[PDB]
Amino acid sequence: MKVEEILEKALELVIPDEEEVRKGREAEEELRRRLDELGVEYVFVGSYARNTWLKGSLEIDVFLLFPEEFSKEELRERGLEIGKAVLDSYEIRYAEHPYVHGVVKGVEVDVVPCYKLKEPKNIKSAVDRTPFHHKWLEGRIKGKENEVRLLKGFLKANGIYGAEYKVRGFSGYLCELLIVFYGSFLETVKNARRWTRRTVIDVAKGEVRKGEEFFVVDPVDEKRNVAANLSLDNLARFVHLCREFMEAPSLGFFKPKHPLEIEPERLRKIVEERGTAVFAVKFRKPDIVDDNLYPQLERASRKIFEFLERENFMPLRSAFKASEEFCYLLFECQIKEISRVFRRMGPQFEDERNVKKFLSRNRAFRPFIENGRWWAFEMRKFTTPEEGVRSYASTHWHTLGKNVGESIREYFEIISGEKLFKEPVTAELCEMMGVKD
RNA sequence: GGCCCGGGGCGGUUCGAUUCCGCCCUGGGCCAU
Numbered sequence: 453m454k455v456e457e458i459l460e461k462a463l464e465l466v467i468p469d470e471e472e473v474r475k476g477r478e479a480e481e482e483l484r485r486r487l488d489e490l491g492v493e494y495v496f497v498g499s500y501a502r503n504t505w506l507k508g509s510l511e512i513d514v515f516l517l518f519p520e521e522f523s524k525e526e527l528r529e530r531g532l533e534i535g536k537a538v539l540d541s542y543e544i545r546y547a548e549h550p551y552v553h554g555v556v557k558g559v560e561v562d563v564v565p566c567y568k569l570k571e572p573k574n575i576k577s578a579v580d581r582t583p584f585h586h587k588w589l590e591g592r593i594k595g596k597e598n599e600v601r602l603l604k605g606f607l608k609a610n611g612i613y614g615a616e617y618k619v620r621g622f623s624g625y626l627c628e629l630l631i632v633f634y635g636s637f638l639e640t641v642k643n644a645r646r647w648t649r650r651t652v653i654d655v656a657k658g659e660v661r662k663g664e665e666f667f668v669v670d671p672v673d674e675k676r677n678v679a680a681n682l683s684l685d686n687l688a689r690f691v692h693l694c695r696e697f698m699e700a701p702s703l704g705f706f707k708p709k710h711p712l713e714i715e716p717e718r719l720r721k722i723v724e725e726r727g728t729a730v731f732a733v734k735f736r737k738p739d740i741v742d743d744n745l746y747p748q749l750e751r752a753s754r755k756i757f758e759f760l761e762r763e764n765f766m767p768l769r770s771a772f773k774a775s776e777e778f779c780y781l782l783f784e785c786q787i788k789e790i791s792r793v794f795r796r797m798g799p800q801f802e803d804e805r806n807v808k809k810f811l812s813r814n815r816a817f818r819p820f821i822e823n824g825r826w827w828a829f830e831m832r833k834f835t836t837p838e839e840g841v842r843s844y845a846s847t848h849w850h851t852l853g854k855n856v857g858e859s860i861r862e863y864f865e866i867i868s869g870e871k872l873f874k875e876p877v878t879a880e881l882c883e884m885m886g887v888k889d
Numbered sequence: 890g891g892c893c894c895g896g897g898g899c900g901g902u903u904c905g906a907u908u909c910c911g912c913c914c915u916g917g918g919c920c921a922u
């Protein structure tokens with residue numbers, strides 16, 4: 453019931469059990485055998501190699517080290533070739549250079565092509581750094597293996613564990629470095645409560661300092677920011693979880709919260725109680741990977757939100773959801789409808805030249821003077837958020853993401869109310885409005 | 890692909906645009922393992 457006791461029970465959630473590790477063992481077993489009966493230089497890395505993987509999150513990563521001279525094409529060609537034979541069920545996967553993911557003796561496995569180097573420099577792509585990481589980190593993270601796990605599980609249970617764009621949280625490598633720096637999961641949590649958006653952590657120098665933005669400098673590359681893809685909001689969300697956990701320890705922070713299934717009528721009653729305008733932009737999901745998709749769903753979500761605010765609808769927040777089939781850009785505005793007339797500022801009264809010009813534009817209402825300057829009554833081309841967004845999406849599709857923008861351009865519709873609550877957006881909507889339960 | 894910094898063109902809107910909404914070529918960097 454107290455801090456340490458809680459952590460104890462918590463280990464039984466992050467650390468694996470024999471069966472799973474054994475399975476990981478025999479897995480790594482064949483994988484080498486096959487890899488050897490080909491004879492290709494390979495390095496085992498990642499959480500598996502270092503015994504820092506999360507219970508029920510087994511995944512063996514293997515980096516194929518090629519010479520400096522080789523062609524990146526050789527890297528992927530020769531890389532994929534290898535992945536093929538060595539893997540039970542391969543699958544081409546994409547991101548940096550491409551790579552292959554499959555299964556062996558029952559476990560997930562990654563095979564990534566990268567250039568084997570001497571000295572962190574000569575460094576080409578992010579993968580060429582991985583190998584150094586495992587090196588620097590292997591002689592240090594021992595014995596604390598579980599402090600790392602407790603951390604991941606923590607971040608995980610609370611939705612901020614990934615480093616990819618669909619998370620923008622903490623990479624697994626970031627975690628390890630922290631455990632090395634603070635020495636324990638408890639120590640990190642305690643200290644993170646004082647972290648700021650301007651905190652710099654230099655593990656290589658055992659130092660912490662003030663910088664421009666949150667920065668955890670890489671042991672292996674003083675210039676990289678291990679935590680570079682960690683959104684500020686998530687950073688903050690963590691800092692807070694830490695204060696909270698400390699004030700009241702709980703096993704709960706180590707258990708994923710359940711999706712909270714709410715019935716469409718309760719949602720409808722909430723939206724009505726809010727008297728707000730809640731609607732969604734739906735369009736066929738592009739067929740690109742998540743690291744390409746999400747950043748675009750973000751941009752589009754943002755660009756529309758902005759149109760909404762300069763257009764005076766008063767958006768409150770925005771959200772977005774992606775299913776196998778389509779996408780959804782959610783918005784909730786304070787203005788359901790707005791007047792058609794609005795005022796547009798004009799020149800100062802003494803400026804004759806411009807006054808003339810301003811008054812020559814014939815409009816339906818005849819302008820007036822207020823505090824030494826002219827103003828005119830203009831009419832809006834639309835009066836509801838949905839109305840205006842249909843106009844914007846339809847004519848500004850190109851700026852919502854190379855891919856997202858093109859899907860919308862070929863089709864999109866605006867869903868609202870009775871029909872909206874049916875779409876698979878309930879959870880995102882509840883979340884977006886802070887609905888609680 | 891997204892993001893940050895810089896050029897060269899244009900369009901729309903506006904009394905007035907380098908200054909808003911956008912589009913084209915283009916230089917630099919960062920992220921995602």
Ligand SMILES: Nc1ccn([C@@H]2O[C@H](COP(=O)(O)OP(=O)(O)OP(=O)(O)O)[C@@H](O)[C@H]2O)c(=O)n1
Nearest residue numbers: 498499500505506513582585615623624625922
């Ligand atoms: N944003 C990232 C992602 C990955 N890596 C490198 O890739 C390794 C992580 O690979 P991944 O399989 O994505 O995660 P793991 O570290 O193995 O941990 P977990 O599998 O539990 O996610 C890190 O150790 C690091 O060398 C990195 O440096 N930065």
Ligand SMILES: [Mg+2]
Nearest residue numbers: 498499511513
């Ligand atoms: Mg892994």
